[PDB]
Scaffold this active site. Structure first.
Site, PDB file in Angstrom:
ATOM      1  N   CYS B 108       0.606  -1.574  -0.102  1.00 45.88           N
ATOM      2  CA  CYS B 108       0.016  -0.286  -0.349  1.00 45.88           C
ATOM      3  C   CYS B 108       1.130   1.359  -0.084  1.00 45.88           C
ATOM      4  O   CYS B 108       1.671   1.758   0.954  1.00 45.88           O
ATOM      5  CB  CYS B 108      -0.739   0.165   1.043  1.00 45.88           C
ATOM      6  SG  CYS B 108      -2.109   1.847   0.986  1.00 45.88           S
ATOM      7  N   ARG B 111       0.198   4.800   2.696  1.00 48.02           N
ATOM      8  CA  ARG B 111       0.290   3.965   4.130  1.00 48.02           C
ATOM      9  C   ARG B 111       0.777   5.646   5.230  1.00 48.02           C
ATOM     10  O   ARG B 111       0.879   5.496   6.307  1.00 48.02           O
ATOM     11  CB  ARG B 111       1.216   3.455   4.291  1.00 48.02           C
ATOM     12  CG  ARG B 111       0.349   1.614   4.405  1.00 48.02           C
ATOM     13  CD  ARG B 111       1.838   0.463   4.753  1.00 48.02           C
ATOM     14  NE  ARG B 111       2.494   0.670   3.695  1.00 48.02           N
ATOM     15  CZ  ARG B 111       3.847  -0.309   3.578  1.00 48.02           C
ATOM     16  NH1 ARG B 111       3.938  -1.018   4.481  1.00 48.02           N
ATOM     17  NH2 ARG B 111       4.647  -0.157   2.119  1.00 48.02           N
ATOM     18  N   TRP B 280      -9.091   7.206  -0.365  1.00 47.75           N
ATOM     19  CA  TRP B 280      -9.405   7.951  -1.552  1.00 47.75           C
ATOM     20  C   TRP B 280      -8.530   7.306  -2.794  1.00 47.75           C
ATOM     21  O   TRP B 280      -7.842   6.281  -2.320  1.00 47.75           O
ATOM     22  CB  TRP B 280      -9.021   9.055  -1.358  1.00 47.75           C
ATOM     23  CG  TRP B 280      -7.823   9.536  -1.022  1.00 47.75           C
ATOM     24  CD1 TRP B 280      -7.206   9.972  -1.489  1.00 47.75           C
ATOM     25  CD2 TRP B 280      -7.911   9.882   1.047  1.00 47.75           C
ATOM     26  NE1 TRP B 280      -5.982   9.566  -0.323  1.00 47.75           N
ATOM     27  CE2 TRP B 280      -6.791   9.857   0.632  1.00 47.75           C
ATOM     28  CE3 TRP B 280      -8.518   9.592   1.798  1.00 47.75           C
ATOM     29  CZ2 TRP B 280      -5.695  10.460   1.939  1.00 47.75           C
ATOM     30  CZ3 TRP B 280      -8.412  10.383   2.888  1.00 47.75           C
ATOM     31  CH2 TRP B 280      -6.942  10.333   3.230  1.00 47.75           C
ATOM     32  N   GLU B 285      -5.168   4.400 -10.882  1.00 46.50           N
ATOM     33  CA  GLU B 285      -6.165   3.440 -10.563  1.00 46.50           C
ATOM     34  C   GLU B 285      -7.303   2.569 -11.330  1.00 46.50           C
ATOM     35  O   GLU B 285      -7.331   2.243 -11.878  1.00 46.50           O
ATOM     36  CB  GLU B 285      -6.890   2.927  -8.643  1.00 46.50           C
ATOM     37  CG  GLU B 285      -5.417   2.439  -7.748  1.00 46.50           C
ATOM     38  CD  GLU B 285      -5.565   2.558  -6.565  1.00 46.50           C
ATOM     39  OE1 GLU B 285      -6.550   1.648  -5.686  1.00 46.50           O
ATOM     40  OE2 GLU B 285      -5.825   4.083  -5.481  1.00 46.50           O
TER      41      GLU B 285
HETATM   42  C1  HEM Z   1      -6.583   6.535   2.110  1.00 44.08           C
HETATM   43  C2  HEM Z   1      -5.426   6.892   0.985  1.00 44.08           C
HETATM   44  C3  HEM Z   1      -5.105   5.177   0.383  1.00 44.08           C
HETATM   45  C4  HEM Z   1      -4.524   5.119  -1.073  1.00 44.08           C
HETATM   46  C5  HEM Z   1      -4.113   6.138  -1.528  1.00 44.08           C
HETATM   47  C6  HEM Z   1      -4.285   3.753  -0.807  1.00 44.08           C
HETATM   48  C7  HEM Z   1      -3.215   3.139  -1.898  1.00 44.08           C
HETATM   49  C8  HEM Z   1      -3.457   2.202  -2.117  1.00 44.08           C
HETATM   50  C9  HEM Z   1      -2.791   2.241  -4.466  1.00 44.08           C
HETATM   51  C10 HEM Z   1      -2.676   2.873  -5.157  1.00 44.08           C
HETATM   52  C11 HEM Z   1      -2.583   0.070  -3.944  1.00 44.08           C
HETATM   53  C12 HEM Z   1      -2.199  -0.516  -5.065  1.00 44.08           C
HETATM   54  C13 HEM Z   1      -4.117  -1.199  -5.411  1.00 44.08           C
HETATM   55  C14 HEM Z   1      -3.967  -1.809  -6.709  1.00 44.08           C
HETATM   56  O1  HEM Z   1      -3.276  -1.552  -7.615  1.00 44.08           O
HETATM   57  O2  HEM Z   1      -4.540  -2.727  -7.187  1.00 44.08           O
HETATM   58  C15 HEM Z   1      -3.099  -0.414  -2.267  1.00 44.08           C
HETATM   59  C16 HEM Z   1      -2.803  -0.970  -1.606  1.00 44.08           C
HETATM   60  C17 HEM Z   1      -3.258  -1.471  -0.745  1.00 44.08           C
HETATM   61  N1  HEM Z   1      -3.781  -0.948   0.369  1.00 44.08           N
HETATM   62 FE1  HEM Z   1      -3.761   1.061   0.174  1.00 44.08          FE
HETATM   63  N2  HEM Z   1      -4.487   2.931   0.071  1.00 44.08           N
HETATM   64  C18 HEM Z   1      -5.489   4.294   0.990  1.00 44.08           C
HETATM   65  C19 HEM Z   1      -5.938   3.036   2.024  1.00 44.08           C
HETATM   66  C20 HEM Z   1      -5.755   2.214   2.543  1.00 44.08           C
HETATM   67  C21 HEM Z   1      -6.751   1.897   3.665  1.00 44.08           C
HETATM   68  C22 HEM Z   1      -8.100   3.097   4.379  1.00 44.08           C
HETATM   69  C23 HEM Z   1      -6.495   0.359   3.715  1.00 44.08           C
HETATM   70  C24 HEM Z   1      -6.821  -0.350   5.294  1.00 44.08           C
HETATM   71  C25 HEM Z   1      -7.527   0.125   5.934  1.00 44.08           C
HETATM   72  C26 HEM Z   1      -5.553   0.492   2.965  1.00 44.08           C
HETATM   73  C27 HEM Z   1      -5.212  -1.038   3.546  1.00 44.08           C
HETATM   74  C28 HEM Z   1      -4.308  -1.203   1.267  1.00 44.08           C
HETATM   75  C29 HEM Z   1      -4.137  -3.164   1.302  1.00 44.08           C
HETATM   76  C30 HEM Z   1      -4.024  -3.774   2.570  1.00 44.08           C
HETATM   77  C31 HEM Z   1      -3.489  -2.860  -0.397  1.00 44.08           C
HETATM   78  C32 HEM Z   1      -2.910  -4.132  -0.510  1.00 44.08           C
HETATM   79  C33 HEM Z   1      -3.996  -5.204  -1.780  1.00 44.08           C
HETATM   80  C34 HEM Z   1      -3.700  -6.284  -1.859  1.00 44.08           C
HETATM   81  O3  HEM Z   1      -2.276  -6.769  -1.148  1.00 44.08           O
HETATM   82  O4  HEM Z   1      -4.180  -6.856  -3.127  1.00 44.08           O
HETATM   83  N3  HEM Z   1      -5.346   1.372   1.983  1.00 44.08           N
HETATM   84  N4  HEM Z   1      -3.097   1.309  -1.388  1.00 44.08           N
HETATM   85  C1  LIG Z   2      -7.549  -7.457  -8.376  1.00 44.95           C
HETATM   86  N1  LIG Z   2      -6.749  -6.167  -7.847  1.00 44.95           N
HETATM   87  C2  LIG Z   2      -6.003  -7.448  -6.811  1.00 44.95           C
HETATM   88  C3  LIG Z   2      -6.411  -7.002  -5.488  1.00 44.95           C
HETATM   89  C4  LIG Z   2      -6.962  -8.311  -4.628  1.00 44.95           C
HETATM   90  C5  LIG Z   2      -7.655  -7.605  -3.699  1.00 44.95           C
HETATM   91  C6  LIG Z   2      -8.120  -8.772  -2.904  1.00 44.95           C
HETATM   92  N2  LIG Z   2      -8.474  -9.713  -1.947  1.00 44.95           N
HETATM   93  C7  LIG Z   2      -7.160  -6.342  -2.820  1.00 44.95           C
HETATM   94  C8  LIG Z   2      -7.278  -5.377  -3.625  1.00 44.95           C
HETATM   95  O1  LIG Z   2      -7.536  -4.601  -3.057  1.00 44.95           O
HETATM   96  C9  LIG Z   2      -6.572  -3.211  -3.755  1.00 44.95           C
HETATM   97  C10 LIG Z   2      -6.910  -2.022  -2.973  1.00 44.95           C
HETATM   98  C11 LIG Z   2      -7.069  -2.059  -1.117  1.00 44.95           C
HETATM   99  C12 LIG Z   2      -6.957  -0.836  -0.735  1.00 44.95           C
HETATM  100  C13 LIG Z   2      -7.273   0.803  -1.587  1.00 44.95           C
HETATM  101  C14 LIG Z   2      -7.546   1.623  -0.567  1.00 44.95           C
HETATM  102  C15 LIG Z   2      -7.408   2.242  -1.594  1.00 44.95           C
HETATM  103  C16 LIG Z   2      -7.154   3.169  -2.831  1.00 44.95           C
HETATM  104  N3  LIG Z   2      -7.335   4.347  -2.950  1.00 44.95           N
HETATM  105  N4  LIG Z   2      -7.073   1.519  -3.116  1.00 44.95           N
HETATM  106  C17 LIG Z   2      -6.756   0.430  -3.187  1.00 44.95           C
HETATM  107  C18 LIG Z   2      -6.431  -0.218  -3.099  1.00 44.95           C
HETATM  108  C19 LIG Z   2      -6.729  -5.358  -5.019  1.00 44.95           C
END
Ligand code: HEM
Ligand SMILES: CNCc1cc(C#N)cc(OCc2ccc3ccc(N)nc3c2)c1
Ligand code: HEM
Ligand SMILES: CNCc1cc(C#N)cc(OCc2ccc3ccc(N)nc3c2)c1
Ligand SMILES: C[C@H](O)[C@H](O)[C@H]1CNc2nc(N)[nH]c(=O)c2N1
Ligand SMILES: C[C@H](O)[C@H](O)[C@H]1CNc2nc(N)[nH]c(=O)c2N1
Ligand SMILES: [Zn+2]
Lengths: 407, 411
Positions: B108, B111, B280, B285
């Site tokens: 993420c 963070r 957000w 994305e």
């Molecule tokens: C607040 C603004 C946030 C932004 C701009 C952001 C940004 C991102 C982005 C761009 C990704 C890649 C997702 C993808 O390409 O599919 C990601 C992954 C992730 N985000 Fe964040 N995020 C935010 C908030 C959060 C919050 C609030 C949580 C949980 C409480 C979180 C947990 C995660 C997790 C667990 C992943 C990994 C997903 C996976 O392993 O498939 N994010 N984030």
């Molecule tokens: C199919 N795409 C891969 C993927 C798989 C799963 C699962 N399980 C979750 C995923 O979450 C991505 C993610 C998680 C949290 C987010 C919070 C904010 C944000 N802007 N994007 C965010 C994107 C992604």
């Protein structure tokens, strides 16, 4: 422990068995992945020879043959006596092509079997090295119709008699530190541009001065040589739309020829093995031109495009980065110099992956290096799972000579 | 053991000590790196050390380690485990847990915001209607009329694995996708399978290009139920381009709230199978992945066409050019409508600062380069040049199987 890889764009699953042959270590553990880290005797030597000869003799369908066993014996005896051994020409060519085939960071590997290998193991002096190198440059360049080549200098003996090319590439632009603060030319080669001058090189102090060769034979002090300008194919950079582009005063060289790596074959170490293919466009236009610690011309370009460079949100950098890369390709294509775009090269690599999984059981690949530095997810490699592991023969990183050289 | 990471653009070196606290496994070995692989009913036996490790962490954080409050809590958890075969987290522990799971999320990029998470405790929930209600309030609070607020709603933890709470949607808000008999797809191709399920469960599909999917919610292991999110709670943004006036005529819009709902939250051995969270969007994305992935809306060509680009040869970089304009348009539309969004340059720059601050105060920051680097213009963002160490800390967010593949049907 027979591993599968999935392409998420196409659902194609490949099964990897080749990784089980792997020997060397990744730097990762069960507890930590180091995938984004840039860099990771007689009794030692014979198993290394054996492994290689076994590979070699299997590849020509004479595994477990008289010839095989005989060769194994001969090398074994030569090792015990001499404390090293010499490769047959056929083995040398095989080893070189497979070092490339095994390069998990190389996107251009579909071409791996068409490598022109130049045996330079009879070379004794820097003047000889120069001559061999000019021949490489002229052959590889081929008036713009590039051909892959490697030139292989004598193998390490006792680490005191190493052949080394001190340059990182055969052809690179100088970089000089200005008193005004910044940097003229290429900032990457500032330390090297210095050493050349520190050694006698008369620097024209331009933006694009082709660096001299600094060649080291048998461990002696390196010597400067000027590559004949007519062997250095260069491309002036213009845009097929922006006529002001030419005035930027940019050009680049046609031949990417990496000269600082070490080639390992059957335990033997070739510290001097310059190799070359041809450019993917992004190497020059994204990294060379637009990296911050390089030419960093992004601002200049966007300015001339008159983009709102006020907020990052306008994506002016992205817009400019594209145009620059359009120009590189256009320029090279216009002057009939071989170049490949990142879409073509990555599509080629997917096919090459398919081929290798099909005919070899796998293909070691480093996703971090294989995905291009722009437009990543609209190229097919982004969606391709890859397994990274170290096979031999291989190209390895080695220390910079000026830190090691016992002057 | 100490490990060092280097930024190759600034030469800044950082020292990681935090990787020592790592418990889970990466998938890699000394002989193989699986860094690009997408994916990597508990008993009282293995539960107490996991509780203890968490409580030790929690009490360190609040500087009461070895206190009587600490020791009594450990005791209370122990008795409760061996008596009931599980345990209940206090509100304080749940909130810490959720924040640290986000903090530990190596993939993420956002963070920097981890400490500002609104935690909604939905552990008293018993039925799908109650889930719908909690989720409605989440969406309303999180959206905040465009001024987005990070939030997470946590439903009851797993017990025997037979009474799981699950949100069957992958995100709370997502568009339907319809496979047509001619092979073409109407709507978001990523959501085709889920869309079919919904329809089978009784969803009356409008069959449009941008239909907000219903919520499919499962409480206490019972069969999932359909619910329509009130449309006035779904904030959406029409996509236009600041210079290209034909761009509006593409008919594109996107929703403003990214809210991932299919992950599993692990805290001290307890498993929360329903824990929807939201922040957000980073513009790419939507603009890069959602609009331009071949397996999604895939609008590069139509955009390229309307731009009259040289589309005969890829070396014209018509795909690259169209991609940038689409992303400009996504960002433009959101800012114009005052809906929180961040561009990829801003987000990555913030991440580097966060990461440095984390190394200094925590001894590290686990990060997955493969995911951290944006899907366009990689090297002109500072993360590209940043070496990163990936390892798994707890609390954490984990993948879990799709519920339609594991659910035991009641009828
Ligand atoms: C607040 C603004 C946030 C932004 C701009 C952001 C940004 C991102 C982005 C761009 C990704 C890649 C997702 C993808 O390409 O599919 C990601 C992954 C992730 N985000 Fe964040 N995020 C935010 C908030 C959060 C919050 C609030 C949580 C949980 C409480 C979180 C947990 C995660 C997790 C667990 C992943 C990994 C997903 C996976 O392993 O498939 N994010 N984030
Ligand atoms: C199919 N795409 C891969 C993927 C798989 C799963 C699962 N399980 C979750 C995923 O979450 C991505 C993610 C998680 C949290 C987010 C919070 C904010 C944000 N802007 N994007 C965010 C994107 C992604
Ligand atoms: C013929 C066309 C070729 C193309 C298009 C190509 C492409 C590339 C690219 C884009 C990279 C990443 C470079 C960087 O970002 O610095 C790379 C790396 C590499 N290439 Fe190839 N290459 C070609 C030929 C060759 C040949 C002939 C060899 C060796 C005989 C070779 C060996 C390597 C190695 C070892 C690396 C990784 C170096 C490292 O680990 O830092 N390539 N290649
Ligand atoms: C500054 N970048 C790090 C780097 C270090 C080393 C070393 N030692 C070699 C490197 O080689 C990159 C390379 C190697 C072979 C190539 C062949 C063809 C081509 N177009 N590019 C190619 C690029 C790169
Ligand atoms: C195979 C590869 O790991 C996969 O396509 C990953 C690549 N990096 C990614 N990075 C992000 N942020 N999101 C993704 O979905 C992916 N997909
Ligand atoms: C930090 C990271 O390891 C470093 O910037 C790498 C990333 N990926 C790369 N990929 C390629 N092809 N070439 C590079 O120089 C790099 N640099
Ligand atoms: Zn790894």
């Amino acid at each position: 422990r027979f591993l599968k890889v999935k392409n998420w764009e196409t659902d194609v699953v490949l099964t990897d068995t080749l990784h089980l042959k792997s020997t060397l270590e990744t730097g990762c553990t069960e507890h930590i992945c180091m995938g984004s880290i840039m860099l990771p005797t007689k009794d030692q030597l014979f198993p290394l020879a054996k492994e290689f000869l076994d590979q070699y003799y299997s590849s020509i369908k004479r595994f477990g043959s008289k010839a095989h066993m005989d060769r194994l014996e001969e090398v074994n005896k030569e090792i015990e006596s001499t404390s090293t051994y010499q490769l047959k020409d056929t083995e040398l060519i095989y080893g070189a092509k497979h070092a490339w085939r095994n390069a998990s960071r190389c996107v251009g590997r579909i071409q791996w079997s068409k490598l022109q290998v130049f045996d330079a193991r009879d070379c004794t002096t820097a003047h000889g090295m120069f001559n061999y190198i000019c021949n490489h440059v002229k052959y590889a360049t081929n008036k713009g119709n590039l051909r892959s080549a490697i030139t292989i200098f004598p193998q390490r003996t006792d680490g005191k008699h190493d052949f080394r090319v001190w340059n990182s590439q055969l052809i690179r632009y100088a970089g000089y530190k200005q008193p005004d603060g910044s940097t003229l030319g290429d900032p990457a080669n500032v330390q090297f541009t210095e050493i050349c001058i520190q050694q006698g090189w008369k620097a024209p102090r331009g933006r694009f001065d082709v660096l001299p060769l600094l060649l080291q034979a048998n461990g002696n002090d390196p010597e400067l040589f000027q590559i004949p300008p007519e062997l250095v194919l260069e491309v002036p950079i213009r845009h097929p739309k922006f006529d002001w582009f030419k005035d930027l005063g940019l050009k680049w060289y046609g031949l990417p020829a990496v000269s600082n790596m070490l080639l390992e074959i059957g335990g033997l170490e070739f510290s001097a093995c310059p190799f070359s293919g041809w450019y993917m466009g992004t190497e020059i236009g994204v990294r060379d031109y637009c990296d911050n610690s390089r030419y960093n011309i992004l601002e200049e370009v966007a300015k001339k495009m008159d983009l709102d460079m006020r907020k990052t949100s306008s994506l002016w950098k992205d817009q400019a980065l594209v145009e620059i890369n359009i120009a590189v390709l256009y320029s090279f294509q216009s002057d009939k110099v071989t170049i490949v775009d990142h879409h073509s090269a990555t599509e080629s690599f997917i096919k090459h992956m398919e081929n290798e999984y099909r005919c070899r059981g796998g293909c070691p690949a480093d996703w971090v290096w294989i995905v291009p530095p722009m437009s990543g997810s609209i190229t097919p490699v982004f969606h391709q799972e890859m397994l990274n592991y170290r096979l031999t023969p291989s190209f390895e990183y080695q220390p910079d000579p000026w830190n090691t050289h016992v002057w």
